[PDB]
Amino acid sequence: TTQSYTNFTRGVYYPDKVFRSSVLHLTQDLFLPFFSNVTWFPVLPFNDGVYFASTEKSNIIRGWIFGTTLDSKTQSLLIVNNATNFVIKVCEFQFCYSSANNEYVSQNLREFVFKNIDGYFKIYSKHTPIIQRDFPQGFSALEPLVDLPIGINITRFQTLLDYYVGYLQPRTFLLKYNENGTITDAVDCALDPLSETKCTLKSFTVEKGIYQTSNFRVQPTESIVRFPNVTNLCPFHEVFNATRFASVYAWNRTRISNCVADYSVLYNFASFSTFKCYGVSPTKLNDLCFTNVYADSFVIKGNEVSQIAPGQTGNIADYNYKLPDDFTGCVIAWNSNKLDSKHSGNYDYWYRSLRKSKLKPFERDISTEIYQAGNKPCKGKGPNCYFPLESYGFRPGHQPYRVVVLSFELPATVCGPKKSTNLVKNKCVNFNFNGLTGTGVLTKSNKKFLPFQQFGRDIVDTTDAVRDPQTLEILDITPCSFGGVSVITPGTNTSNQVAVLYQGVNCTEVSVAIHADQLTPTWRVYSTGSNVFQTRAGCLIGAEYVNNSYECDIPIGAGVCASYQTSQSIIAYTMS
Ligand SMILES: *[C@@H]1O[C@H](CO)[C@@H](O)[C@H](O)[C@H]1NC(C)=O
Ligand SMILES: *[C@@H]1O[C@H](CO)[C@@H](O)[C@H](O)[C@H]1NC(C)=O
Ligand SMILES: *[C@@H]1O[C@H](CO)[C@@H](O)[C@H](O)[C@H]1NC(C)=O
Ligand SMILES: *[C@@H]1O[C@H](CO)[C@@H](O)[C@H](O)[C@H]1NC(C)=O
Ligand SMILES: *[C@@H]1O[C@H](CO)[C@@H](O)[C@H](O)[C@H]1NC(C)=O
Ligand SMILES: *[C@@H]1O[C@H](CO)[C@@H](O)[C@H](O)[C@H]1NC(C)=O
Ligand SMILES: *[C@@H]1O[C@H](CO)[C@@H](O)[C@H](O)[C@H]1NC(C)=O
């Protein structure tokens, strides 16, 4: 009734329209992987596509049922088939139809490769008259039939009754095009060492020798996080809940340190209007640690809201407040008119707009001495001498607003909450120490760190050791294995047996990595007993050592060679 069947090598369709002839194309798409459990037939999940391939039944399978839940929900689709051919419809539908509510005809084996991507439905089909008992044997490419926009989300389907529903994954194929525009054969670039070299050479035949191929890398296992212990201070309420902040000329420089700052509380405090900033992207703030967080304050009239930014000098934002060009902070601001503005003016709401020269950024001057610019010693206003003063008068645009510019700098004190996970060590594991990211195998160090320096660098200027900021212990950041693999073949015309060579690894490390499934090359070679040899360039899998000494046929390295010799098997010997 339902058996796993893993003997299909079919389901190759035309990727596109453009004509080709007598070429070997290489393309990647969602193809059905060779030798995958399909079914041998309820509702089924629609991951990315299927390969409904029912054999002859004199048209009793009829159509299909699609949709997102198929039970009185978002619209569905039908693939009803009859003598007139397709009569497909798309609407909500209900229990069969009986209360359908809420399109054209297109004139043995019954293959389909239904695929729904980018709001388009694809019904590739091919009616192959295969009668011989060897049903799985043979090759037949599929031709597109109709593509129509459906727009609806599909994640399940039901047959409307020998079914062979399969599943689709993203893979890479090397297609063969005929002289008269057809496809004769194809090869999957994931199975065995053999059907990977034939993809890099872009040919269906290979000659004897070694062919360099892609790299191998040991994947990690889990992830850990380490943050400073706890403070629970987050004193952001003092700044943001003050009646009057300051003037533009005289402004606070509040310092914030030793707190577990939460940045999610600011979003509901007022009507923000300029919550944008540089250096660090917003909504990613609550994941990393800082060093010198500060906070300013202004009651700027509102015409210079765009003037508060790196640059944008406008003769008003150059004597009062100036930001550096490489300003790594945020310019959080909001709107306030109910309590700030008033029909009259304010004494301290002024700006010195008549100073001789602009300031270096991050500087403030309070001196109230009258400016002197006359030739003779001046006594008051009227000559070039004049004490700058404005005393701006608000009038309920022109409504004064509030600006709470921060200042970041990146020994860390201020950073957000994050769960802590106990150390594991001695495994290829991700890590997060305060603020950083990497991958390696942590272990107990043996260095002589002095009690003021945390990190540890190297000649190449790479991180080497980081102190744990909960136990005050030093560790190592050594990464784990990666390299390259080379495939040995004796020629397609002779045999189909290969060997592999993981370059430059003491491969007891990879032998255990096979069992726990950490390798990147998902394909595996038959690693039986008396079948692994440790060379000076790595280890050879699939060849057995021999005490004899012949002439070299395929040069390996370090003084050994591999040749195909007669039962027949690949052997590895020493040059002579
Ligand atoms: C293959 O699919 C069948 C479907 O019946 C399932 O039972 C079986 O466990 C699968 N085999 C795998 C995932 O190795
Ligand atoms: C796959 O298994 C089927 C089971 O019916 C068999 O007929 C077919 O020959 C097999 N194909 C192989 C082993 O390539
Ligand atoms: C498809 O779209 C509908 C309507 O917006 C939505 O409710 C549903 O979650 C989506 N389904 C899937 C499987 O993404
Ligand atoms: C189509 O291709 C086949 C296969 O090679 C060939 O025999 C046949 O002559 C071609 N038909 C043409 C060119 O009309
Ligand atoms: C600005 O100046 C002082 C300096 O200590 C600061 O503590 C205070 O919060 C600010 N004053 C007002 C009135 O906002
Ligand atoms: C961190 O806090 C825990 C809370 O139980 C405490 O036991 C531990 O000593 C603290 N560690 C340091 C280094 O202060
Ligand atoms: C490989 O590692 C094993 C186990 O630690 C060791 O006995 C052997 O000498 C190593 N081989 C080489 C070539 O370093």
Side-chain angles (χ1 to χ4, degrees), residues 260-268 270-283 285-300 302 305-306 308-336:
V260 176
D262 185 74
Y263 302 83
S264 44
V265 65
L266 301 103
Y267 303 101
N268 60 5
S271 178
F272 283 161
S273 300
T274 291
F275 182 75
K276 84 182 171 323
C277 75
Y278 295 99
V280 189
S281 84
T283 62
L285 280 181
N286 215 338
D287 213 28
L288 72 164
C289 295
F290 310 79
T291 301
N292 276 51
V293 182
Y294 292 101
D296 294 28
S297 296
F298 315 82
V299 183
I300 311 152
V305 176
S306 66
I308 191 66
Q312 279 77 329
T313 62
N315 219 333
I316 308 294
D318 62 357
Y319 324 113
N320 304 51
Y321 197 36
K322 184 178 184 293
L323 294 174
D325 292 331
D326 61 357
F327 165 41
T328 173
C330 312
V331 171
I332 298 169
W334 76 81
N335 266 348
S336 288

Side-chain angles (χ1 to χ4, degrees), residues 58-61 63-64 78-88 105-107 110 112 125 127 145 160:
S58 66
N59 189 359
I60 48 184
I61 298 86
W64 272 258
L78 294 175
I79 310 312
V80 194
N81 189 359
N82 72 79
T84 299
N85 281 38
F86 277 27
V87 298
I88 53 166
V105 191
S106 296
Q107 183 66 41
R110 181 68 66 191
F112 293 99
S125 178
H127 301 88
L145 172 152
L160 267 182

